[PDB]
Amino acid sequence: MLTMKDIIRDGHPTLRQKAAELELPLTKEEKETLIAMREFLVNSQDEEIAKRYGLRSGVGLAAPQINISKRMIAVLIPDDGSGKSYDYMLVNPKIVSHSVQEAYLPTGEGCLSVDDNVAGLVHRHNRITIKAKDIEGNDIQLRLKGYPAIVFQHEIDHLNGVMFYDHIDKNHPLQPHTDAVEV
Ligand SMILES: O=C(O)C[C@@H](Cc1ccccc1)C(=O)SCC(=O)c1ccccc1
Ligand code: NI
């Protein structure tokens, strides 16, 4: 199983690479790492197993963060109120379309690869559409609004070597952009 000593840290140059597109079907090794990625999130969201392996809680993980410069991500966003959950393992994900309307988390964002908390808003597209491949090479099209949209944008950002904190306005970090929804 993956643990925190697998996650590489801010300053590591793999995080600033642009990750390569995978050929299909995937290799057994590639499937294993994507499955594990998911298992990490699951594990980090169990209070006992996180206690035991000192896992920080995660809802998203990009392969670059375990130092694998390939275009795959996992997302595991448990129910939390509404009856929507999000358990996706995606290969070569791509945002094909999005809203003009931006959204943001009022308390900013976090990143497993980052150890300081960093205050500042990260404006994102409130709605998105992603085309991707699943772990068996079948086709996925996701329509996402709100928190999931942000989460998946966060992880996609990782594949282009973009960190959430690059989106912070230097001089007015807590200033909402006009007409942006708070999530
Ligand atoms: O480090 C990562 O890339 C994963 C990260 C992504 C993230 C996206 C959008 C906003 C904040 C962070 C996290 O999953 S941080 C953990 C988290 O937000 C959480 C987990 C369980 C319960 C409540 C919150
Ligand atoms: Ni991150």
Short mmCIF file of C-alpha atoms and ligand atoms in Angstrom, two decimals:
data_model
loop_
_atom_site.label_atom_id
_atom_site.label_comp_id
_atom_site.label_asym_id
_atom_site.label_seq_id
_atom_site.Cartn_x
_atom_site.Cartn_y
_atom_site.Cartn_z
CA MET A 1 0.00 0.00 0.00
CA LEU A 2 1.03 3.57 -0.64
CA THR A 3 1.69 5.86 2.32
CA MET A 4 2.84 9.43 2.82
CA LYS A 5 6.46 8.49 2.21
CA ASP A 6 5.39 7.72 -1.35
CA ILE A 7 4.00 11.23 -1.94
CA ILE A 8 6.62 13.61 -3.22
CA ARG A 9 6.83 17.10 -1.92
CA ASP A 10 6.69 20.62 -3.19
CA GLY A 11 10.06 21.54 -4.75
CA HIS A 12 10.44 18.07 -6.28
CA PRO A 13 10.80 18.69 -10.05
CA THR A 14 8.39 15.89 -11.22
CA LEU A 15 5.64 18.10 -9.85
CA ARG A 16 6.61 20.75 -12.39
CA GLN A 17 6.78 18.39 -15.36
CA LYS A 18 4.03 17.97 -17.92
CA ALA A 19 2.97 14.33 -17.53
CA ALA A 20 2.93 12.04 -20.62
CA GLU A 21 -0.28 10.65 -22.29
CA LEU A 22 -0.65 6.89 -21.76
CA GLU A 23 -1.04 4.38 -24.60
CA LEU A 24 -3.85 1.88 -24.35
CA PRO A 25 -4.59 -0.68 -23.12
CA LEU A 26 -2.68 0.02 -19.91
CA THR A 27 0.15 -2.20 -18.57
CA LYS A 28 -0.39 -4.32 -15.47
CA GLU A 29 2.04 -2.01 -13.67
CA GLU A 30 0.00 1.06 -14.66
CA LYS A 31 -3.25 -0.51 -13.47
CA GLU A 32 -1.67 -1.51 -10.14
CA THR A 33 -0.46 2.07 -9.52
CA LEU A 34 -3.83 3.58 -10.37
CA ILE A 35 -5.62 1.00 -8.21
CA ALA A 36 -3.23 1.74 -5.40
CA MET A 37 -3.71 5.47 -5.82
CA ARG A 38 -7.35 4.89 -5.21
CA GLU A 39 -6.67 2.56 -2.30
CA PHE A 40 -4.59 5.37 -0.77
CA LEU A 41 -7.53 7.79 -0.77
CA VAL A 42 -9.91 5.21 0.61
CA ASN A 43 -7.31 4.41 3.28
CA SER A 44 -6.67 8.10 4.12
CA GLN A 45 -10.43 8.49 4.61
CA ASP A 46 -10.61 5.66 7.18
CA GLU A 47 -9.84 7.23 10.61
CA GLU A 48 -8.27 4.04 12.05
CA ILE A 49 -6.01 3.16 9.10
CA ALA A 50 -5.01 6.82 8.72
CA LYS A 51 -4.17 6.86 12.47
CA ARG A 52 -2.09 3.70 12.05
CA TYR A 53 -0.15 4.74 8.92
CA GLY A 54 -0.12 8.45 9.57
CA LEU A 55 -2.09 9.27 6.43
CA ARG A 56 -3.17 12.79 5.70
CA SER A 57 -6.76 12.83 4.35
CA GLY A 58 -7.14 12.94 0.54
CA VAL A 59 -9.97 13.17 -2.02
CA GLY A 60 -7.77 13.37 -5.13
CA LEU A 61 -4.38 12.13 -6.24
CA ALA A 62 -2.44 12.61 -9.52
CA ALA A 63 0.25 10.10 -10.55
CA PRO A 64 2.91 12.90 -10.60
CA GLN A 65 2.49 13.21 -6.83
CA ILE A 66 3.86 9.66 -6.40
CA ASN A 67 6.55 10.65 -8.86
CA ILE A 68 5.06 9.04 -11.94
CA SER A 69 4.87 11.48 -14.79
CA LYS A 70 1.81 9.96 -16.48
CA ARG A 71 -1.62 11.29 -17.07
CA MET A 72 -3.69 9.52 -14.55
CA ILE A 73 -5.62 10.59 -11.54
CA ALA A 74 -7.95 9.29 -8.91
CA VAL A 75 -10.85 10.94 -7.15
CA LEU A 76 -12.76 9.66 -4.19
CA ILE A 77 -15.21 12.10 -2.78
CA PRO A 78 -17.51 10.28 -0.33
CA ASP A 79 -21.25 11.02 -0.08
CA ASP A 80 -21.29 14.10 2.23
CA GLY A 81 -25.00 15.07 2.35
CA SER A 82 -26.54 15.11 -1.12
CA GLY A 83 -26.40 11.44 -2.30
CA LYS A 84 -23.72 12.24 -4.92
CA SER A 85 -20.42 10.37 -4.56
CA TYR A 86 -17.46 10.32 -6.90
CA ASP A 87 -15.26 7.33 -7.18
CA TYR A 88 -13.28 7.71 -10.43
CA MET A 89 -9.95 6.43 -11.78
CA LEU A 90 -9.18 8.33 -15.02
CA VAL A 91 -6.54 7.94 -17.69
CA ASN A 92 -5.66 10.87 -20.00
CA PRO A 93 -8.34 13.14 -18.61
CA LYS A 94 -9.13 16.33 -20.51
CA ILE A 95 -11.46 19.28 -19.88
CA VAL A 96 -13.14 19.77 -23.23
CA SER A 97 -15.57 22.44 -22.07
CA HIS A 98 -16.40 24.74 -19.08
CA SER A 99 -18.48 27.61 -17.70
CA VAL A 100 -17.41 31.22 -17.70
CA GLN A 101 -18.68 31.38 -14.15
CA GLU A 102 -15.91 30.76 -11.64
CA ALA A 103 -16.19 29.13 -8.21
CA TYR A 104 -13.91 28.82 -5.15
CA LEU A 105 -13.53 27.18 -1.74
CA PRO A 106 -13.90 29.92 0.87
CA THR A 107 -11.03 28.45 2.97
CA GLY A 108 -8.80 27.93 -0.06
CA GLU A 109 -7.18 24.64 -1.04
CA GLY A 110 -4.76 21.97 0.24
CA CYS A 111 -2.42 19.52 -1.42
CA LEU A 112 -0.95 16.26 -0.03
CA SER A 113 2.31 17.28 -1.63
CA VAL A 114 2.32 20.57 0.32
CA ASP A 115 3.09 20.84 4.02
CA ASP A 116 2.37 24.51 4.86
CA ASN A 117 -1.33 25.40 4.77
CA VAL A 118 -1.61 28.22 2.20
CA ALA A 119 -4.36 30.77 2.47
CA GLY A 120 -5.73 32.40 -0.60
CA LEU A 121 -8.61 31.68 -2.94
CA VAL A 122 -8.23 29.56 -6.06
CA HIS A 123 -10.85 30.50 -8.64
CA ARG A 124 -11.89 27.65 -10.88
CA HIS A 125 -14.60 26.90 -13.40
CA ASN A 126 -17.85 26.18 -11.57
CA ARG A 127 -18.95 23.52 -14.19
CA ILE A 128 -16.80 21.28 -16.41
CA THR A 129 -16.94 18.49 -18.90
CA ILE A 130 -14.18 15.93 -19.03
CA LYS A 131 -13.50 13.31 -21.58
CA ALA A 132 -11.29 10.51 -20.35
CA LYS A 133 -10.49 6.82 -20.45
CA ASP A 134 -11.20 4.37 -17.61
CA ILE A 135 -8.68 1.80 -16.38
CA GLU A 136 -9.89 -0.69 -19.04
CA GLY A 137 -9.71 1.89 -21.83
CA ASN A 138 -13.43 2.54 -22.04
CA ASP A 139 -14.76 6.09 -22.55
CA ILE A 140 -16.01 8.45 -19.89
CA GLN A 141 -17.67 11.81 -20.11
CA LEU A 142 -18.18 13.65 -16.84
CA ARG A 143 -20.26 16.71 -16.24
CA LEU A 144 -19.30 18.29 -12.90
CA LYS A 145 -20.40 21.36 -11.01
CA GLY A 146 -19.10 22.66 -7.70
CA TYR A 147 -16.80 20.87 -5.31
CA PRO A 148 -16.17 17.92 -7.65
CA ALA A 149 -15.42 20.29 -10.46
CA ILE A 150 -12.76 21.91 -8.29
CA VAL A 151 -11.32 18.70 -7.11
CA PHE A 152 -10.95 17.32 -10.62
CA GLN A 153 -9.50 20.62 -11.84
CA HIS A 154 -7.02 20.44 -8.99
CA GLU A 155 -5.81 16.99 -10.06
CA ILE A 156 -5.80 17.81 -13.73
CA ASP A 157 -3.70 20.84 -12.94
CA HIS A 158 -1.12 18.39 -11.57
CA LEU A 159 -0.69 16.79 -14.97
CA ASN A 160 0.34 20.12 -16.49
CA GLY A 161 2.73 20.82 -13.66
CA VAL A 162 0.48 23.43 -12.03
CA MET A 163 0.13 23.77 -8.25
CA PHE A 164 -2.98 25.19 -6.66
CA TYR A 165 -0.97 28.07 -5.14
CA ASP A 166 0.02 29.37 -8.61
CA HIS A 167 -3.60 30.61 -8.87
CA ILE A 168 -3.33 32.94 -5.84
CA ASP A 169 -3.46 36.63 -6.46
CA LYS A 170 -0.25 38.02 -4.90
CA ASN A 171 -1.66 41.26 -3.39
CA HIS A 172 -5.32 40.46 -2.63
CA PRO A 173 -5.27 36.68 -1.97
CA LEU A 174 -8.64 36.62 -0.14
CA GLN A 175 -10.52 38.82 -2.55
CA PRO A 176 -13.35 37.03 -4.35
CA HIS A 177 -13.60 37.70 -8.07
CA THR A 178 -16.88 39.43 -8.89
CA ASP A 179 -19.83 37.08 -9.47
CA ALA A 180 -17.83 33.97 -8.44
CA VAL A 181 -19.69 31.30 -6.49
CA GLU A 182 -18.38 30.26 -3.08
CA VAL A 183 -18.58 26.46 -2.66
O1 LIG B 1 -3.24 16.76 -2.67
C1 LIG B 1 -4.10 16.53 -3.51
O2 LIG B 1 -3.82 16.68 -4.82
C2 LIG B 1 -5.46 16.04 -3.03
C3 LIG B 1 -6.26 17.14 -2.34
C4 LIG B 1 -7.00 17.94 -3.40
C5 LIG B 1 -7.83 19.15 -3.04
C6 LIG B 1 -8.72 19.58 -4.01
C7 LIG B 1 -9.53 20.67 -3.77
C8 LIG B 1 -9.45 21.35 -2.56
C9 LIG B 1 -8.58 20.95 -1.58
C10 LIG B 1 -7.76 19.86 -1.83
C11 LIG B 1 -7.00 16.72 -1.08
O3 LIG B 1 -7.71 15.74 -1.24
S1 LIG B 1 -6.95 17.41 0.47
C12 LIG B 1 -8.05 16.61 1.64
C13 LIG B 1 -9.49 17.10 1.83
O4 LIG B 1 -9.86 18.12 1.28
C14 LIG B 1 -10.51 16.37 2.71
C15 LIG B 1 -10.50 14.97 2.86
C16 LIG B 1 -11.46 14.31 3.67
C17 LIG B 1 -12.44 15.02 4.35
C18 LIG B 1 -12.46 16.42 4.21
C19 LIG B 1 -11.51 17.08 3.41
NI NI B 2 -2.33 18.84 -4.82
#
